[PDB]
PDB file of all heavy atoms in Angstrom:
ATOM      1  N   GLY Q   1     236.128 268.045 183.348  1.00  0.00           N
ATOM      2  CA  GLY Q   1     236.584 269.297 182.778  1.00  0.00           C
ATOM      3  C   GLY Q   1     235.534 270.383 182.882  1.00  0.00           C
ATOM      4  O   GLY Q   1     235.849 271.537 183.192  1.00  0.00           O
ATOM      5  N   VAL Q   2     234.275 270.018 182.627  1.00  0.00           N
ATOM      6  CA  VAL Q   2     233.180 270.968 182.789  1.00  0.00           C
ATOM      7  C   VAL Q   2     233.075 271.411 184.240  1.00  0.00           C
ATOM      8  O   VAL Q   2     232.903 272.601 184.530  1.00  0.00           O
ATOM      9  CB  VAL Q   2     231.859 270.353 182.292  1.00  0.00           C
ATOM     10  CG1 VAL Q   2     230.720 271.356 182.425  1.00  0.00           C
ATOM     11  CG2 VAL Q   2     231.998 269.882 180.857  1.00  0.00           C
ATOM     12  N   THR Q   3     233.179 270.462 185.174  1.00  0.00           N
ATOM     13  CA  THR Q   3     233.116 270.803 186.590  1.00  0.00           C
ATOM     14  C   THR Q   3     234.242 271.751 186.977  1.00  0.00           C
ATOM     15  O   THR Q   3     234.019 272.734 187.693  1.00  0.00           O
ATOM     16  CB  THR Q   3     233.169 269.531 187.436  1.00  0.00           C
ATOM     17  OG1 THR Q   3     232.012 268.726 187.166  1.00  0.00           O
ATOM     18  CG2 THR Q   3     233.207 269.870 188.917  1.00  0.00           C
ATOM     19  N   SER Q   4     235.457 271.487 186.489  1.00  0.00           N
ATOM     20  CA  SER Q   4     236.592 272.348 186.806  1.00  0.00           C
ATOM     21  C   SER Q   4     236.404 273.747 186.234  1.00  0.00           C
ATOM     22  O   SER Q   4     236.643 274.743 186.926  1.00  0.00           O
ATOM     23  CB  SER Q   4     237.886 271.724 186.285  1.00  0.00           C
ATOM     24  OG  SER Q   4     237.892 271.680 184.870  1.00  0.00           O
ATOM     25  N   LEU Q   5     235.968 273.843 184.974  1.00  0.00           N
ATOM     26  CA  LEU Q   5     235.753 275.151 184.364  1.00  0.00           C
ATOM     27  C   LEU Q   5     234.687 275.945 185.111  1.00  0.00           C
ATOM     28  O   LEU Q   5     234.879 277.131 185.410  1.00  0.00           O
ATOM     29  CB  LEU Q   5     235.368 274.990 182.895  1.00  0.00           C
ATOM     30  CG  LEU Q   5     236.476 274.535 181.942  1.00  0.00           C
ATOM     31  CD1 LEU Q   5     235.892 274.148 180.592  1.00  0.00           C
ATOM     32  CD2 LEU Q   5     237.532 275.621 181.787  1.00  0.00           C
ATOM     33  N   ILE Q   6     233.561 275.305 185.433  1.00  0.00           N
ATOM     34  CA  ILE Q   6     232.483 276.020 186.107  1.00  0.00           C
ATOM     35  C   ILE Q   6     232.873 276.399 187.532  1.00  0.00           C
ATOM     36  O   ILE Q   6     232.494 277.473 188.016  1.00  0.00           O
ATOM     37  CB  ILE Q   6     231.184 275.192 186.071  1.00  0.00           C
ATOM     38  CG1 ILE Q   6     230.807 274.854 184.626  1.00  0.00           C
ATOM     39  CG2 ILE Q   6     230.048 275.944 186.738  1.00  0.00           C
ATOM     40  CD1 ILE Q   6     230.652 276.069 183.732  1.00  0.00           C
ATOM     41  N   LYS Q   7     233.639 275.553 188.226  1.00  0.00           N
ATOM     42  CA  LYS Q   7     234.040 275.892 189.588  1.00  0.00           C
ATOM     43  C   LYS Q   7     235.106 276.980 189.586  1.00  0.00           C
ATOM     44  O   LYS Q   7     235.231 277.746 190.548  1.00  0.00           O
ATOM     45  CB  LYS Q   7     234.519 274.644 190.332  1.00  0.00           C
ATOM     46  CG  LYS Q   7     235.900 274.148 189.945  1.00  0.00           C
ATOM     47  CD  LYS Q   7     236.258 272.887 190.719  1.00  0.00           C
ATOM     48  CE  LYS Q   7     237.620 272.347 190.312  1.00  0.00           C
ATOM     49  NZ  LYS Q   7     238.722 273.283 190.668  1.00  0.00           N
ATOM     50  N   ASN Q   8     235.887 277.068 188.506  1.00  0.00           N
ATOM     51  CA  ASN Q   8     236.771 278.211 188.326  1.00  0.00           C
ATOM     52  C   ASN Q   8     236.004 279.479 187.988  1.00  0.00           C
ATOM     53  O   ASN Q   8     236.452 280.575 188.342  1.00  0.00           O
ATOM     54  CB  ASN Q   8     237.796 277.926 187.226  1.00  0.00           C
ATOM     55  CG  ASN Q   8     238.965 278.895 187.256  1.00  0.00           C
ATOM     56  OD1 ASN Q   8     239.128 279.662 188.203  1.00  0.00           O
ATOM     57  ND2 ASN Q   8     239.780 278.868 186.208  1.00  0.00           N
ATOM     58  N   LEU Q   9     234.858 279.354 187.315  1.00  0.00           N
ATOM     59  CA  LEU Q   9     234.058 280.530 186.992  1.00  0.00           C
ATOM     60  C   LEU Q   9     233.407 281.129 188.235  1.00  0.00           C
ATOM     61  O   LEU Q   9     233.262 282.352 188.330  1.00  0.00           O
ATOM     62  CB  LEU Q   9     232.996 280.174 185.950  1.00  0.00           C
ATOM     63  CG  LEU Q   9     233.486 280.107 184.503  1.00  0.00           C
ATOM     64  CD1 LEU Q   9     232.361 279.688 183.565  1.00  0.00           C
ATOM     65  CD2 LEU Q   9     234.079 281.444 184.082  1.00  0.00           C
ATOM     66  N   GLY Q  10     233.010 280.291 189.192  1.00  0.00           N
ATOM     67  CA  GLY Q  10     232.431 280.792 190.424  1.00  0.00           C
ATOM     68  C   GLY Q  10     231.304 279.953 190.992  1.00  0.00           C
ATOM     69  O   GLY Q  10     230.870 280.178 192.125  1.00  0.00           O
ATOM     70  N   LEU Q  11     230.819 278.982 190.221  1.00  0.00           N
ATOM     71  CA  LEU Q  11     229.725 278.169 190.738  1.00  0.00           C
ATOM     72  C   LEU Q  11     230.270 276.901 191.392  1.00  0.00           C
ATOM     73  O   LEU Q  11     231.170 276.260 190.843  1.00  0.00           O
ATOM     74  CB  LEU Q  11     228.760 277.792 189.617  1.00  0.00           C
ATOM     75  CG  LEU Q  11     227.378 277.277 190.016  1.00  0.00           C
ATOM     76  CD1 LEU Q  11     226.551 278.389 190.639  1.00  0.00           C
ATOM     77  CD2 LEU Q  11     226.667 276.684 188.811  1.00  0.00           C
ATOM     78  N   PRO Q  12     229.753 276.521 192.561  1.00  0.00           N
ATOM     79  CA  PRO Q  12     230.251 275.317 193.236  1.00  0.00           C
ATOM     80  C   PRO Q  12     230.049 274.073 192.382  1.00  0.00           C
ATOM     81  O   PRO Q  12     229.250 274.038 191.445  1.00  0.00           O
ATOM     82  CB  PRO Q  12     229.417 275.251 194.519  1.00  0.00           C
ATOM     83  CG  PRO Q  12     228.941 276.643 194.735  1.00  0.00           C
ATOM     84  CD  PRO Q  12     228.741 277.224 193.367  1.00  0.00           C
ATOM     85  N   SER Q  13     230.798 273.030 192.734  1.00  0.00           N
ATOM     86  CA  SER Q  13     230.773 271.782 191.984  1.00  0.00           C
ATOM     87  C   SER Q  13     229.541 270.940 192.295  1.00  0.00           C
ATOM     88  O   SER Q  13     228.935 270.369 191.381  1.00  0.00           O
ATOM     89  CB  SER Q  13     232.042 270.976 192.266  1.00  0.00           C
ATOM     90  OG  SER Q  13     232.363 270.998 193.644  1.00  0.00           O
ATOM     91  N   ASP Q  14     229.159 270.842 193.573  1.00  0.00           N
ATOM     92  CA  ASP Q  14     227.965 270.081 193.923  1.00  0.00           C
ATOM     93  C   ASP Q  14     226.715 270.674 193.282  1.00  0.00           C
ATOM     94  O   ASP Q  14     225.853 269.928 192.805  1.00  0.00           O
ATOM     95  CB  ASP Q  14     227.811 270.010 195.442  1.00  0.00           C
ATOM     96  CG  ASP Q  14     227.927 271.369 196.106  1.00  0.00           C
ATOM     97  OD1 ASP Q  14     228.258 272.349 195.410  1.00  0.00           O
ATOM     98  OD2 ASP Q  14     227.680 271.457 197.327  1.00  0.00           O
ATOM     99  N   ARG Q  15     226.609 272.004 193.245  1.00  0.00           N
ATOM    100  CA  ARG Q  15     225.477 272.633 192.570  1.00  0.00           C
ATOM    101  C   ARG Q  15     225.517 272.386 191.068  1.00  0.00           C
ATOM    102  O   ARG Q  15     224.465 272.218 190.442  1.00  0.00           O
ATOM    103  CB  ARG Q  15     225.456 274.133 192.863  1.00  0.00           C
ATOM    104  CG  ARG Q  15     224.063 274.718 193.031  1.00  0.00           C
ATOM    105  CD  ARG Q  15     224.124 276.114 193.629  1.00  0.00           C
ATOM    106  NE  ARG Q  15     222.805 276.615 194.004  1.00  0.00           N
ATOM    107  CZ  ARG Q  15     222.330 276.612 195.245  1.00  0.00           C
ATOM    108  NH1 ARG Q  15     223.068 276.135 196.237  1.00  0.00           N
ATOM    109  NH2 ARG Q  15     221.119 277.090 195.494  1.00  0.00           N
ATOM    110  N   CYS Q  16     226.716 272.349 190.479  1.00  0.00           N
ATOM    111  CA  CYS Q  16     226.841 272.034 189.059  1.00  0.00           C
ATOM    112  C   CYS Q  16     226.340 270.627 188.765  1.00  0.00           C
ATOM    113  O   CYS Q  16     225.584 270.412 187.809  1.00  0.00           O
ATOM    114  CB  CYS Q  16     228.297 272.191 188.615  1.00  0.00           C
ATOM    115  SG  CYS Q  16     228.592 271.829 186.869  1.00  0.00           S
ATOM    116  N   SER Q  17     226.753 269.654 189.580  1.00  0.00           N
ATOM    117  CA  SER Q  17     226.275 268.287 189.399  1.00  0.00           C
ATOM    118  C   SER Q  17     224.771 268.186 189.615  1.00  0.00           C
ATOM    119  O   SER Q  17     224.085 267.486 188.862  1.00  0.00           O
ATOM    120  CB  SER Q  17     227.016 267.337 190.341  1.00  0.00           C
ATOM    121  OG  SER Q  17     226.985 267.807 191.677  1.00  0.00           O
ATOM    122  N   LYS Q  18     224.242 268.881 190.626  1.00  0.00           N
ATOM    123  CA  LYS Q  18     222.801 268.890 190.856  1.00  0.00           C
ATOM    124  C   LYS Q  18     222.043 269.452 189.659  1.00  0.00           C
ATOM    125  O   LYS Q  18     221.032 268.877 189.239  1.00  0.00           O
ATOM    126  CB  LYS Q  18     222.483 269.703 192.111  1.00  0.00           C
ATOM    127  CG  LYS Q  18     221.190 269.324 192.816  1.00  0.00           C
ATOM    128  CD  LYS Q  18     221.147 267.848 193.172  1.00  0.00           C
ATOM    129  CE  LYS Q  18     219.816 267.483 193.812  1.00  0.00           C
ATOM    130  NZ  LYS Q  18     219.652 266.009 193.944  1.00  0.00           N
ATOM    131  N   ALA Q  19     222.516 270.568 189.100  1.00  0.00           N
ATOM    132  CA  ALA Q  19     221.839 271.190 187.971  1.00  0.00           C
ATOM    133  C   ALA Q  19     221.974 270.378 186.692  1.00  0.00           C
ATOM    134  O   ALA Q  19     221.071 270.419 185.850  1.00  0.00           O
ATOM    135  CB  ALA Q  19     222.379 272.603 187.750  1.00  0.00           C
ATOM    136  N   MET Q  20     223.076 269.648 186.520  1.00  0.00           N
ATOM    137  CA  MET Q  20     223.224 268.790 185.353  1.00  0.00           C
ATOM    138  C   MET Q  20     222.496 267.461 185.501  1.00  0.00           C
ATOM    139  O   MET Q  20     222.221 266.806 184.489  1.00  0.00           O
ATOM    140  CB  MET Q  20     224.706 268.532 185.068  1.00  0.00           C
ATOM    141  CG  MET Q  20     225.330 269.538 184.114  1.00  0.00           C
ATOM    142  SD  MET Q  20     226.839 268.932 183.336  1.00  0.00           S
ATOM    143  CE  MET Q  20     226.997 270.074 181.965  1.00  0.00           C
ATOM    144  N   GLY Q  21     222.179 267.052 186.727  1.00  0.00           N
ATOM    145  CA  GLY Q  21     221.478 265.802 186.938  1.00  0.00           C
ATOM    146  C   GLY Q  21     219.971 265.935 187.006  1.00  0.00           C
ATOM    147  O   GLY Q  21     219.253 265.236 186.285  1.00  0.00           O
ATOM    148  N   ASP Q  22     219.473 266.828 187.862  1.00  0.00           N
ATOM    149  CA  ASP Q  22     218.034 266.936 188.071  1.00  0.00           C
ATOM    150  C   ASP Q  22     217.427 268.140 187.358  1.00  0.00           C
ATOM    151  O   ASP Q  22     216.326 268.042 186.808  1.00  0.00           O
ATOM    152  CB  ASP Q  22     217.725 266.996 189.570  1.00  0.00           C
ATOM    153  CG  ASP Q  22     218.137 265.733 190.299  1.00  0.00           C
ATOM    154  OD1 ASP Q  22     217.694 264.639 189.890  1.00  0.00           O
ATOM    155  OD2 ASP Q  22     218.897 265.832 191.283  1.00  0.00           O
ATOM    156  N   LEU Q  23     218.123 269.280 187.358  1.00  0.00           N
ATOM    157  CA  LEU Q  23     217.595 270.462 186.684  1.00  0.00           C
ATOM    158  C   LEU Q  23     217.567 270.287 185.171  1.00  0.00           C
ATOM    159  O   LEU Q  23     216.751 270.922 184.494  1.00  0.00           O
ATOM    160  CB  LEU Q  23     218.413 271.701 187.053  1.00  0.00           C
ATOM    161  CG  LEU Q  23     218.023 272.485 188.310  1.00  0.00           C
ATOM    162  CD1 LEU Q  23     216.597 273.009 188.203  1.00  0.00           C
ATOM    163  CD2 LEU Q  23     218.203 271.652 189.575  1.00  0.00           C
ATOM    164  N   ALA Q  24     218.443 269.440 184.626  1.00  0.00           N
ATOM    165  CA  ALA Q  24     218.413 269.153 183.195  1.00  0.00           C
ATOM    166  C   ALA Q  24     217.262 268.216 182.848  1.00  0.00           C
ATOM    167  O   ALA Q  24     216.542 268.435 181.866  1.00  0.00           O
ATOM    168  CB  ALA Q  24     219.746 268.552 182.751  1.00  0.00           C
ATOM    169  N   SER Q  25     217.070 267.167 183.647  1.00  0.00           N
ATOM    170  CA  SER Q  25     215.937 266.276 183.453  1.00  0.00           C
ATOM    171  C   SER Q  25     214.602 266.985 183.627  1.00  0.00           C
ATOM    172  O   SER Q  25     213.666 266.699 182.876  1.00  0.00           O
ATOM    173  CB  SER Q  25     216.022 265.095 184.422  1.00  0.00           C
ATOM    174  OG  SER Q  25     215.866 265.534 185.759  1.00  0.00           O
ATOM    175  N   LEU Q  26     214.502 267.923 184.567  1.00  0.00           N
ATOM    176  CA  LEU Q  26     213.269 268.673 184.770  1.00  0.00           C
ATOM    177  C   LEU Q  26     212.989 269.646 183.631  1.00  0.00           C
ATOM    178  O   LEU Q  26     211.836 269.786 183.210  1.00  0.00           O
ATOM    179  CB  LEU Q  26     213.325 269.424 186.100  1.00  0.00           C
ATOM    180  CG  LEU Q  26     212.619 268.747 187.275  1.00  0.00           C
ATOM    181  CD1 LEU Q  26     213.199 267.371 187.539  1.00  0.00           C
ATOM    182  CD2 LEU Q  26     212.740 269.609 188.510  1.00  0.00           C
ATOM    183  N   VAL Q  27     214.022 270.315 183.110  1.00  0.00           N
ATOM    184  CA  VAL Q  27     213.810 271.214 181.981  1.00  0.00           C
ATOM    185  C   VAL Q  27     213.529 270.433 180.702  1.00  0.00           C
ATOM    186  O   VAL Q  27     212.859 270.953 179.801  1.00  0.00           O
ATOM    187  CB  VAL Q  27     215.005 272.173 181.809  1.00  0.00           C
ATOM    188  CG1 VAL Q  27     216.236 271.447 181.318  1.00  0.00           C
ATOM    189  CG2 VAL Q  27     214.655 273.311 180.874  1.00  0.00           C
TER     190      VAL Q  27
END
């Protein structure tokens, strides 16, 4: 659902998964 909402907002899905997987762990 988060992926669908964000991809409807304008951000790609693969970038969303990347930012939730590695960018979250790094922050």
